[PDB]
């Protein structure tokens, strides 16, 4: 089911005292091969590229000769004129090459299969030819680089010590830094003070249970679906350009939201006060980012037709829209009126719509039985049922039925701070995932 | 159509926030009795609006009624593109000072047609011989009209701010 | 000493579209363009524009004893045009019309502007090196001699 775990797995030390740099390598290879991986031997650079033209065969089902592989190698996969940024863009944005065969038919060669990601074959290798390196290599390309240390190299100086040929090691998205007792991970940002252990991430369980050691970290995160979802569906290549990786509580809340959608659609549920739910992530979050990944994975999920991330305007429809235009390509304005918002409800393929609740009430109190009624519609609020039970919501319970009404709160109106509005007892029902 | 959502400074927590729509002109007392109060007079939380220009969340309603007169004074082709004129000017009052200087080319749509209008129709540079009439560069003359004066391009025509 | 425009409230201009065929094809108002200008004792025009076309013209109907005067780029080098116009007519953005009032004879304004043309080409002469010309201000803010009545 989920990605961020709910059950605390068994974590035991298997020493192998962690003042070494090879025993934890062997233990890590043992645990990954227990998790059904494949260890091959490439003490070279070209044979690694020979692995790609065989592992990609199973993923695409078509046969290269050597002559097509010349073109595919030098024009698309292994351009010498490219660094880390465009190659990361090739990982996350342009991951398909529209390749022309010598038989002259255009076929789409993938790199990472993103729809049905079980086909994406993983392998494990280690260092060859600096320090000691283990590499989880996905579909021929090296993606995750586990870098190991000792206790004398503390976690702050672990990053601070060290930050063609080879050019193939510019596909590395992550750098899982660990020593034997603490384990942190991050993406390609290499500053000294700011990109220290504060910007890196403690992987954790659902609520607050942080993970430090290796064996528990390997048992949790390095599953196939888990680590491939962390690589693919939960990382944003911002057009700064900067790769941004979600926090684990963000991923957990997004998974609870999307599984609530998935479990509610299969049991024909809509317009129920228990069909909703709400999240409390207060601040220091990038709630823009969590809401964006929730809405973006909702849009492709094919059960629905419209997603309304909708707030109350006090310079928010200019602000958060500017956030979602930062995550460059696509989000449709609810700007500027209730004439053209209907045009946005006519349009598709860019299904995330960011409007204000006031334009929605101006649409819903009039305009005579809109034709976007029967479609499956997901609301993502801000100032949710833990902040309001507003007149717009009872207008909504009057008009709409096939809606999944979710929301976010910054400070929830609990019974402990019930001075403003009610609690959540008949609007969103249960709380889903929180952070404090 | 040219309206606001103005309530309320009371209920900072905004528990069932109120106050829907008010066109122009605006009474203080009619809106105040529409939206209530917080036992004193602090109101006009300008949350949402729909206006051809931009206004802040702390603007007095008297300034809104002041600006609405100058906005509704102008013809519709100006009112359709008030932000485009604001990209060169700075205020609606400054637009009202120079509201007759703006020349509007409904016929012309791009700089080639603006140059062809100034040459063929007006004869701003002089008479046009017919054997010369096809052999006149319009693109370079259009670029120099762009770099000399100040032209703004919209959907309807071309706005020319003259001195 | 009379400031210009205090003799009578002069009028600006006004122009329809040219995409509008029904506002340009027929009619009976003399549509005065500056290529019609440069002439004296104007009785008609090249275009007999529509009397309905004032609905989207921003033109003003002027009386039958007016003076017509261009403000667009014939000057900055030479003498300005000036015309006695005898019919109620409408003119484009490229020019203006002045009507006097009650203190004068209209030919005195005509020939006074014709005499002072050599200085009112200078009065708002440059206003940038563009197609732009003498503005409304220093055209308006020039002071002319107006004597006793019998010496008009």
XYZ file of C-alpha atoms in Angstrom:
751
model
C 0.000 0.000 0.000
C 1.665 3.112 1.357
C 5.179 4.517 1.048
C 5.882 6.103 4.421
C 5.357 3.226 6.818
C 2.884 2.932 9.683
C 4.378 -0.071 11.512
C 7.745 0.071 13.258
C 9.862 -2.693 11.728
C 12.460 -4.625 13.732
C 15.764 -2.732 13.978
C 18.658 -4.758 15.383
C 22.434 -4.168 15.363
C 24.406 -6.878 13.557
C 27.926 -5.744 14.450
C 30.259 -5.629 12.310
C 31.530 -2.640 14.314
C 31.039 0.599 12.398
C 34.649 1.807 12.698
C 35.179 0.038 9.347
C 34.357 1.064 5.787
C 33.766 -2.378 4.254
C 31.624 -4.394 6.670
C 28.660 -2.037 6.376
C 29.137 -2.212 2.597
C 28.792 -5.998 2.797
C 25.795 -5.734 5.144
C 24.139 -3.211 2.817
C 24.703 -5.437 -0.233
C 23.298 -8.387 1.758
C 20.178 -6.431 2.717
C 19.573 -5.118 -0.807
C 19.961 -8.601 -2.286
C 17.556 -9.798 0.408
C 15.225 -7.154 -1.043
C 15.528 -8.790 -4.472
C 18.210 -6.817 -6.305
C 20.966 -7.790 -8.741
C 24.692 -7.231 -8.205
C 26.850 -7.259 -11.332
C 30.562 -6.567 -11.790
C 31.692 -3.612 -13.919
C 35.296 -2.629 -13.151
C 35.203 -0.292 -16.160
C 33.230 2.517 -17.815
C 32.254 1.185 -21.245
C 30.736 -2.093 -20.012
C 28.434 -0.040 -17.778
C 27.179 1.459 -21.022
C 26.946 -2.109 -22.317
C 24.556 -2.817 -19.444
C 22.254 -0.022 -20.634
C 21.631 -1.467 -24.108
C 20.462 -4.705 -22.467
C 18.427 -3.513 -19.477
C 16.648 -0.965 -21.653
C 15.653 -3.807 -24.008
C 13.268 -5.343 -21.478
C 11.854 -1.901 -20.717
C 11.125 -0.972 -24.343
C 10.769 -4.370 -26.012
C 12.668 -3.412 -29.172
C 16.093 -4.325 -30.545
C 18.983 -2.010 -31.317
C 21.861 -2.942 -33.537
C 25.227 -1.311 -32.943
C 24.524 1.384 -35.540
C 21.322 2.681 -33.936
C 23.066 2.492 -30.574
C 25.762 4.843 -31.911
C 23.074 7.446 -32.641
C 21.201 6.879 -29.375
C 24.426 6.947 -27.354
C 26.036 10.046 -28.810
C 22.966 12.172 -29.586
C 20.663 11.523 -26.617
C 21.979 9.544 -23.658
C 25.671 10.457 -23.389
C 26.082 13.947 -24.827
C 29.561 15.225 -23.880
C 28.311 18.824 -24.136
C 25.938 18.467 -21.160
C 26.456 18.648 -17.412
C 24.278 17.816 -14.432
C 21.353 20.224 -14.915
C 20.152 19.207 -18.374
C 20.748 15.558 -17.500
C 18.551 15.915 -14.408
C 15.983 17.523 -16.722
C 16.319 14.453 -18.946
C 15.603 12.323 -15.884
C 12.484 14.203 -14.817
C 11.106 16.111 -17.850
C 12.455 14.797 -21.175
C 12.735 11.114 -20.309
C 11.580 9.836 -23.711
C 13.600 9.906 -26.928
C 11.548 9.847 -30.129
C 14.066 7.610 -31.840
C 14.226 6.851 -35.562
C 15.216 3.305 -36.429
C 17.338 2.125 -39.324
C 14.111 0.367 -40.350
C 12.630 3.911 -40.421
C 9.848 3.892 -37.884
C 9.555 6.388 -35.045
C 9.359 4.697 -31.664
C 9.433 6.176 -28.190
C 12.398 4.910 -26.190
C 11.767 5.463 -22.496
C 14.236 5.786 -19.655
C 12.087 5.363 -16.532
C 8.623 3.879 -16.999
C 6.495 6.195 -14.878
C 2.971 4.806 -15.325
C 3.599 1.157 -14.401
C 6.861 1.534 -12.511
C 7.216 -2.159 -11.614
C 8.915 -2.736 -14.984
C 11.737 -0.330 -14.017
C 14.560 -2.753 -13.282
C 17.073 -1.925 -10.565
C 20.627 -3.162 -10.054
C 23.382 -2.533 -7.522
C 27.075 -1.840 -8.125
C 29.947 -0.476 -6.065
C 32.958 1.791 -6.592
C 35.742 1.375 -9.132
C 38.830 3.256 -10.419
C 38.143 9.071 -3.901
C 36.094 7.512 -1.105
C 33.915 4.401 -1.027
C 30.720 4.351 -3.081
C 27.730 2.033 -3.477
C 25.354 2.815 -6.340
C 21.770 1.751 -6.889
C 21.570 1.853 -10.675
C 18.101 1.998 -12.221
C 17.558 0.570 -15.725
C 21.220 0.923 -16.665
C 21.523 4.488 -15.395
C 23.125 5.165 -11.985
C 20.519 7.004 -9.926
C 21.168 6.675 -6.175
C 24.671 6.958 -4.708
C 25.022 5.641 -1.167
C 28.188 7.175 0.283
C 29.475 5.674 3.515
C 31.546 7.098 6.367
C 32.599 6.297 9.947
C 31.904 7.739 13.391
C 35.016 9.938 13.373
C 33.604 11.717 10.325
C 30.634 13.429 11.977
C 27.387 14.031 10.101
C 28.016 17.762 9.674
C 31.507 17.266 8.233
C 30.321 14.162 6.336
C 28.911 16.417 3.644
C 31.558 19.085 4.263
C 34.545 16.847 3.461
C 34.077 16.228 -0.281
C 31.511 18.693 -1.703
C 34.287 13.141 -17.266
C 35.647 10.577 -16.999
C 33.196 9.379 -15.961
C 30.281 11.212 -17.570
C 27.735 8.499 -16.723
C 27.867 9.460 -13.036
C 26.098 12.755 -13.735
C 22.742 10.939 -13.626
C 22.995 10.750 -9.824
C 19.961 12.397 -8.250
C 20.543 11.593 -4.572
C 23.504 11.180 -2.227
C 22.469 9.051 0.748
C 25.186 10.014 3.224
C 25.604 7.720 6.199
C 28.233 6.456 8.614
C 26.910 3.436 10.500
C 24.659 5.146 13.025
C 23.068 8.155 11.266
C 21.730 8.333 7.713
C 20.750 11.414 5.703
C 19.804 12.078 2.081
C 19.423 15.080 -0.224
C 19.739 16.164 -3.870
C 22.162 18.085 -6.029
C 22.815 21.237 -3.949
C 26.392 21.615 -2.685
C 26.821 24.676 -0.450
C 28.904 24.591 2.723
C 26.891 26.219 5.512
C 23.381 26.175 4.056
C 23.455 22.727 2.391
C 24.773 21.087 5.576
C 22.773 18.547 7.631
C 19.931 21.071 8.128
C 18.793 20.974 4.488
C 19.286 17.214 4.333
C 16.522 14.938 5.521
C 15.883 12.439 8.287
C 13.723 9.721 6.761
C 11.052 8.713 9.239
C 7.854 6.781 9.896
C 4.313 8.155 9.682
C 3.978 10.481 12.664
C 7.377 11.318 14.188
C 9.542 8.183 14.444
C 12.870 9.223 12.953
C 15.245 6.658 11.444
C 19.000 6.809 12.044
C 20.724 3.447 11.440
C 21.151 1.576 8.137
C 19.326 -1.752 8.515
C 16.029 -0.126 9.479
C 16.571 2.499 6.761
C 17.212 -0.261 4.232
C 14.154 -2.209 5.391
C 11.950 0.876 5.067
C 13.025 3.020 2.149
C 15.003 0.849 -0.282
C 12.002 -1.179 -1.366
C 11.462 -1.070 -5.122
C 8.154 0.812 -5.158
C 9.213 3.034 -2.246
C 12.554 4.212 -3.607
C 11.259 4.479 -7.169
C 8.354 6.615 -5.952
C 10.799 8.830 -4.059
C 12.826 9.182 -7.267
C 9.940 9.700 -9.661
C 6.590 10.851 -8.325
C 7.742 12.943 -5.352
C 10.541 15.143 -6.667
C 10.080 18.439 -8.498
C 12.663 19.799 -10.904
C 11.999 23.468 -10.199
C 12.877 25.898 -12.997
C 15.197 27.828 -10.681
C 16.770 25.251 -11.723
C 16.813 23.218 -8.514
C 15.640 19.718 -7.667
C 13.343 19.729 -4.634
C 12.590 16.554 -2.681
C 9.546 16.309 -0.443
C 9.671 15.797 3.296
C 8.510 12.352 4.506
C 5.521 13.768 6.398
C 4.540 15.596 3.201
C 4.681 12.319 1.253
C 2.715 10.551 3.995
C -0.040 13.186 3.993
C -0.208 13.100 0.185
C -0.493 9.305 0.267
C -3.298 9.418 2.841
C -5.121 11.982 0.673
C -4.766 9.989 -2.533
C -5.615 6.665 -0.913
C -8.705 8.260 0.629
C -9.657 9.288 -2.918
C -8.857 5.805 -4.240
C -10.849 4.039 -1.508
C -13.772 6.448 -1.803
C -14.113 6.144 -5.584
C -14.195 2.339 -5.560
C -17.078 2.327 -3.046
C -19.154 4.976 -4.948
C -18.792 7.575 -2.188
C -19.260 11.318 -2.638
C -20.756 14.230 -0.646
C -20.171 12.556 2.651
C -18.796 14.358 5.713
C -16.619 11.275 6.268
C -15.501 11.281 2.617
C -13.355 14.367 3.236
C -10.458 14.774 5.652
C -7.977 17.414 6.696
C -4.265 17.987 7.269
C -2.531 20.124 9.876
C 0.928 21.150 8.713
C 1.445 24.507 10.385
C 4.444 26.365 8.908
C 7.982 25.966 7.629
C 6.519 23.490 5.147
C 6.076 24.800 1.666
C 2.364 24.046 1.819
C 2.395 25.270 -1.784
C 4.612 22.278 -2.609
C 2.532 19.686 -0.727
C -0.730 21.017 -2.168
C 0.845 21.113 -5.631
C 1.914 17.487 -5.508
C -1.493 16.495 -4.123
C -3.325 18.314 -6.916
C -0.911 17.219 -9.658
C -1.121 13.549 -8.723
C -4.884 13.972 -8.397
C -5.161 15.282 -11.978
C -3.462 12.289 -13.610
C -5.314 9.812 -11.374
C -8.103 9.447 -14.018
C -10.942 9.051 -11.501
C -11.613 12.791 -11.542
C -12.099 15.654 -13.980
C -11.545 18.902 -12.051
C -9.322 19.948 -9.154
C -10.092 23.243 -7.426
C -7.307 24.358 -5.132
C -9.303 27.261 -3.746
C -8.451 29.846 -1.062
C -9.771 33.210 0.140
C -8.039 36.120 -1.568
C -5.838 38.408 0.427
C -3.138 38.505 -2.278
C -3.166 34.719 -2.549
C -4.431 34.176 -6.099
C -1.399 36.180 -7.194
C 0.974 34.582 -4.677
C 0.349 30.826 -4.835
C -0.207 31.001 -8.589
C 3.279 32.536 -8.751
C 4.406 29.531 -6.725
C 2.763 27.122 -9.141
C 4.207 28.958 -12.118
C 7.559 28.475 -10.395
C 6.980 24.726 -10.727
C 7.083 25.802 -14.317
C 4.647 24.373 -16.896
C 0.981 24.162 -16.072
C -1.697 25.561 -13.753
C -4.841 27.386 -14.920
C -5.827 30.769 -13.487
C -9.109 31.330 -11.781
C -8.164 34.905 -12.515
C -9.924 37.135 -13.055
C -13.683 36.812 -12.927
C -16.718 34.575 -13.159
C -16.677 34.992 -16.939
C -13.741 33.003 -18.283
C -13.622 30.840 -15.203
C -16.412 29.032 -17.045
C -14.039 28.939 -20.018
C -11.507 27.317 -17.690
C -14.128 24.753 -16.686
C -14.634 24.140 -20.403
C -10.913 23.618 -21.046
C -9.009 20.495 -19.967
C -5.514 18.853 -19.984
C -4.367 21.396 -17.360
C -6.947 20.375 -14.805
C -5.517 22.199 -11.763
C -7.617 25.348 -11.311
C -6.683 27.897 -8.650
C -9.583 30.237 -7.919
C -10.933 32.159 -4.965
C -13.952 31.088 -2.951
C -15.643 34.423 -3.664
C -15.601 33.882 -7.434
C -16.952 30.403 -6.728
C -19.868 31.796 -4.701
C -20.450 34.317 -7.485
C -20.630 31.349 -9.856
C -22.683 29.111 -7.569
C -25.327 31.589 -6.371
C -26.355 32.157 -10.011
C -25.691 30.903 -13.577
C -28.409 28.247 -13.525
C -27.199 24.627 -13.249
C -23.655 24.662 -14.624
C -22.782 21.729 -16.943
C -19.587 20.758 -15.066
C -21.782 19.314 -12.335
C -21.693 15.535 -12.799
C -17.911 15.305 -13.158
C -15.736 14.070 -10.303
C -14.297 17.165 -8.615
C -11.674 17.399 -5.860
C -11.544 20.501 -3.687
C -8.355 21.376 -1.849
C -9.052 24.226 0.537
C -7.003 26.395 2.776
C -8.516 27.545 6.075
C -10.300 24.200 6.176
C -12.969 22.652 8.423
C -10.490 23.248 11.263
C -10.797 26.960 10.409
C -14.330 27.492 9.025
C -17.745 25.959 8.413
C -18.639 28.733 6.037
C -21.711 29.743 4.079
C -19.902 28.777 0.868
C -19.653 25.230 2.215
C -23.394 24.972 2.780
C -23.955 26.469 -0.680
C -21.695 23.645 -1.850
C -23.649 21.003 0.068
C -26.729 22.490 -1.594
C -25.372 22.391 -5.142
C -22.530 19.914 -5.618
C -22.474 16.220 -4.719
C -19.659 14.453 -6.596
C -16.878 16.218 -4.716
C -13.955 15.173 -2.534
C -13.639 18.117 -0.164
C -10.206 18.208 1.474
C -8.483 21.059 3.223
C -5.456 22.386 5.058
C -5.110 24.355 8.277
C -2.291 26.389 9.757
C -3.619 26.545 13.296
C -6.600 24.197 13.704
C -9.647 25.335 15.582
C -9.524 22.528 18.139
C -11.824 22.340 21.131
C -8.715 23.735 22.870
C -8.918 26.925 20.743
C -12.624 26.939 19.818
C -13.005 30.726 20.148
C -13.524 31.274 16.417
C -15.548 28.490 14.797
C -16.633 24.906 15.397
C -14.593 21.708 15.295
C -14.532 19.145 12.479
C -17.429 16.829 13.324
C -19.714 17.004 10.272
C -17.626 18.692 7.556
C -14.383 16.796 6.885
C -14.718 14.056 9.495
C -11.381 12.557 10.431
C -7.952 14.097 10.631
C -5.568 12.407 8.202
C -1.923 13.347 8.821
C -0.253 16.006 10.943
C 3.101 17.488 11.911
C 4.237 19.488 14.930
C -18.547 43.703 -13.103
C -16.369 46.340 -11.387
C -17.176 45.282 -7.830
C -15.586 44.229 -4.523
C -15.933 41.795 -1.598
C -15.524 44.206 1.312
C -15.931 42.659 4.787
C -14.605 42.662 7.493
C -11.837 43.899 9.793
C -13.754 42.268 12.620
C -13.372 38.474 12.760
C -9.681 38.329 11.930
C -10.194 34.567 12.279
C -12.904 35.043 9.592
C -15.275 32.432 11.020
C -18.041 32.474 8.399
C -16.630 35.558 6.717
C -19.337 37.765 5.228
C -19.951 40.630 2.825
C -20.493 39.757 -0.779
C -20.775 42.263 -3.592
C -21.157 46.020 -3.931
C -21.064 47.900 -7.215
C -20.472 51.616 -7.443
C -21.317 54.063 -5.844
C -20.945 52.723 -2.301
C -22.585 53.817 0.937
C -20.795 53.381 4.240
C -23.996 52.660 6.147
C -25.651 50.298 3.649
C -22.556 48.079 3.499
C -22.115 48.374 7.280
C -25.665 47.185 7.907
C -25.232 44.489 5.255
C -22.121 43.063 6.937
C -22.612 44.060 10.570
C -19.724 45.228 12.740
C -17.451 44.159 15.601
C -19.233 46.552 18.053
C -17.139 49.413 16.593
C -16.467 50.964 13.176
C -13.585 49.132 11.523
C -14.580 47.657 8.166
C -13.767 47.510 4.418
C -11.530 44.469 4.387
C -10.939 44.505 0.634
C -10.364 40.799 0.118
C -11.512 40.093 -3.433
C -12.345 42.464 -6.249
C -13.016 42.673 -9.961
C -11.677 45.925 -11.400
C -9.736 46.964 -14.518
C -6.901 48.170 -12.257
C -5.114 47.093 -9.076
C -6.051 48.223 -5.563
C -4.692 47.363 -2.120
C -6.454 45.708 0.806
C -6.452 48.853 2.991
C -7.889 51.389 0.537
C -10.615 53.690 1.845
C -13.977 53.391 0.116
C -13.970 57.111 -0.661
C -10.859 56.588 -2.769
C -12.681 53.784 -4.582
C -15.605 56.099 -5.340
C -13.037 58.717 -6.378
C -11.346 56.348 -8.825
C -14.624 54.973 -10.202
C -15.602 58.393 -11.577
C -12.406 58.669 -13.614
C -12.619 55.038 -14.740
C -16.242 55.348 -15.875
C -15.454 58.684 -17.554
C -13.299 57.043 -20.232
C -14.540 55.374 -23.435
C -14.737 51.597 -23.613
C -11.625 51.093 -25.759
C -9.628 52.833 -23.037
C -11.479 50.941 -20.295
C -10.757 47.629 -22.026
C -6.993 48.256 -21.752
C -6.446 50.318 -18.603
C -3.616 48.116 -17.336
C -1.876 48.426 -20.713
C -1.998 52.198 -20.330
C -0.823 51.781 -16.735
C 2.299 50.038 -18.078
C 3.400 53.509 -19.252
C 1.600 55.899 -16.890
C 1.499 55.738 -13.084
C -2.033 56.667 -11.957
C -5.588 57.142 -13.150
C -5.290 60.862 -12.371
C -2.222 61.118 -14.608
C -4.159 59.238 -17.284
C -6.963 61.767 -16.808
C -4.514 64.627 -17.380
C -3.468 63.268 -20.783
C -6.671 61.449 -21.767
C -6.896 63.202 -25.152
C -3.265 62.661 -26.187
C -3.739 58.927 -26.770
C -4.333 58.227 -30.463
C -6.036 54.922 -31.246
C -5.440 52.854 -34.386
C -8.402 50.521 -34.602
C -7.458 49.903 -38.237
C -3.748 49.236 -37.703
C -2.723 46.085 -35.855
C 1.082 45.960 -36.156
C 3.979 48.299 -36.853
C 4.044 47.579 -40.595
C 0.471 48.846 -40.870
C 1.265 51.849 -38.656
C 4.109 52.836 -40.984
C 1.895 52.209 -44.029
C -0.774 54.452 -42.485
C 1.626 57.302 -41.712
C 3.166 57.150 -45.192
C 0.384 56.218 -47.620
C -2.637 57.841 -45.962
C -1.227 60.921 -44.249
C 1.846 61.667 -46.322
C 3.801 62.662 -43.231
C 7.095 62.540 -45.137
C 5.640 64.032 -48.326
C 4.143 62.916 -51.608
C 4.493 59.310 -52.725
C 5.302 58.584 -56.390
C 3.454 55.513 -57.637
C 6.568 53.893 -59.097
C 8.213 54.582 -55.732
C 5.074 53.536 -53.814
C 6.017 49.863 -53.749
C 9.750 50.459 -53.239
C 9.565 52.039 -49.773
C 10.900 50.171 -46.751
C 8.285 50.035 -44.005
C 10.003 47.764 -41.481
C 13.012 49.993 -40.791
C 10.774 53.063 -40.708
C 8.516 51.160 -38.325
C 11.476 50.356 -36.069
C 12.508 53.998 -36.049
C 8.960 55.097 -35.237
C 9.120 52.595 -32.378
C 12.446 53.929 -31.110
C 11.475 57.581 -31.580
C 8.070 57.764 -29.894
C 6.156 55.483 -27.546
C 3.785 52.885 -29.003
C 1.758 50.262 -27.119
C 0.127 47.265 -28.810
C -3.154 45.725 -27.646
C -5.872 43.436 -28.992
C -8.040 46.184 -30.492
C -5.561 48.478 -32.237
C -2.401 50.389 -31.416
C -2.290 53.040 -28.707
C 0.051 55.950 -29.429
C 0.950 58.222 -26.523
C 1.925 61.492 -28.160
C 3.577 64.524 -26.610
C -4.127 91.309 -25.476
C -6.135 88.113 -25.892
C -4.916 84.607 -25.135
C -5.834 82.162 -27.899
C -8.933 80.063 -27.327
C -10.439 82.810 -25.167
C -11.840 84.184 -28.431
C -13.987 81.039 -28.575
C -13.882 77.409 -27.443
C -12.019 75.515 -30.148
C -12.662 71.818 -30.734
C -10.299 68.862 -30.901
C -10.968 66.366 -33.678
C -12.289 62.799 -33.778
C -11.971 59.760 -36.084
C -14.019 56.581 -36.751
C -12.605 53.248 -37.775
C -11.808 52.480 -41.396
C -12.873 48.855 -40.940
C -16.444 50.170 -40.556
C -17.755 50.257 -44.126
C -21.171 51.765 -43.287
C -19.451 54.688 -41.508
C -17.123 55.563 -44.413
C -18.830 54.625 -47.689
C -21.660 57.165 -48.064
C -23.113 60.252 -46.398
C -23.000 64.021 -46.533
C -20.685 65.469 -43.850
C -17.454 66.908 -45.304
C -14.671 64.728 -43.877
C -11.645 67.018 -43.825
C -8.251 65.299 -43.980
C -4.943 67.246 -44.094
C -4.445 66.230 -47.729
C -7.615 68.222 -48.394
C -5.997 71.025 -46.372
C -3.556 73.638 -47.614
C -6.506 75.231 -49.424
C -8.449 78.428 -48.783
C -12.266 78.837 -48.675
C -13.071 75.174 -48.164
C -16.590 74.388 -49.389
C -16.550 70.566 -49.416
C -14.140 67.663 -49.006
C -12.875 64.609 -50.830
C -14.907 62.328 -48.541
C -18.630 62.821 -47.898
C -18.718 60.770 -44.698
C -21.891 59.409 -43.094
C -24.078 61.557 -40.865
C -24.752 58.400 -38.839
C -20.965 57.892 -38.486
C -20.833 60.527 -35.710
C -22.083 57.727 -33.415
C -18.524 56.298 -33.288
C -16.453 59.287 -34.426
C -15.753 61.505 -31.376
C -16.259 64.385 -33.826
C -18.101 67.609 -33.044
C -20.444 69.458 -35.387
C -18.919 72.899 -35.927
C -20.685 76.006 -37.347
C -20.507 77.346 -40.889
C -17.936 80.127 -40.325
C -15.014 78.288 -38.771
C -11.266 78.054 -39.330
C -9.480 74.754 -39.963
C -5.839 74.309 -39.015
C -3.528 71.300 -39.003
C -1.319 70.272 -36.086
C 0.559 67.331 -37.641
C 3.949 67.567 -39.332
C 3.390 69.859 -42.305
C 5.065 72.452 -40.076
C 8.437 72.205 -38.233
C 9.858 73.442 -41.543
C 7.420 75.752 -43.328
C 4.246 77.855 -43.075
C 1.163 76.291 -41.518
C -2.078 75.730 -43.423
C -5.189 77.685 -42.502
C -8.628 77.579 -44.084
C -11.930 79.388 -43.901
C -14.423 76.540 -43.726
C -17.955 77.439 -44.785
C -19.852 74.178 -44.183
C -20.538 72.228 -40.958
C -17.925 69.511 -41.303
C -15.968 66.913 -39.335
C -12.207 66.372 -39.282
C -9.821 63.658 -38.155
C -7.186 63.402 -35.420
C -4.601 64.955 -37.762
C -5.932 68.532 -37.442
C -8.157 70.894 -35.454
C -10.828 73.549 -35.919
C -11.251 76.857 -34.098
C -14.533 78.739 -33.685
C -14.502 82.315 -32.342
C -17.166 84.134 -30.288
C -18.660 87.599 -30.029
C -15.574 89.830 -29.637
C -14.270 89.784 -33.173
C -14.560 89.364 -36.884
C -13.672 85.792 -37.907
C -11.445 86.935 -40.782
C -9.388 88.875 -38.231
C -8.627 85.625 -36.377
C -7.901 83.910 -39.711
C -5.445 86.519 -40.939
C -4.012 87.114 -37.465
C -3.071 83.435 -37.271
C -1.839 83.676 -40.864
C 0.347 86.629 -39.878
C 1.580 85.035 -36.641
C 2.227 81.687 -38.332
C 5.925 82.550 -38.615
C 6.066 82.744 -34.799
C 3.569 80.048 -33.770
C 5.550 77.566 -35.801
C 8.234 78.561 -33.266
C 5.988 78.848 -30.186
C 5.796 75.074 -29.586
C 8.319 74.265 -32.277
C 10.158 71.080 -31.352
C 8.117 69.018 -28.826
C 10.462 66.157 -29.662
C 11.891 65.204 -33.028
C 9.025 62.826 -33.785
C 5.935 63.189 -35.987
C 4.539 65.232 -33.050
C 4.286 68.974 -33.396
C 2.964 72.135 -31.721
C 0.967 70.974 -28.714
C -2.274 72.338 -27.303
C -0.508 74.424 -24.654
C 1.723 76.951 -26.403
C -0.657 77.079 -29.337
C -3.332 77.942 -26.773
C -1.208 80.183 -24.531
C -0.108 82.778 -27.090
C -1.431 86.323 -26.692
C -2.506 88.345 -29.735
C -3.430 92.011 -30.252
C -7.170 92.684 -30.348
C -7.885 96.405 -30.915
C -10.951 98.610 -30.764
C -13.919 97.272 -32.715
C -13.850 99.446 -35.866
C -10.222 98.475 -36.508
C -11.071 94.830 -36.964
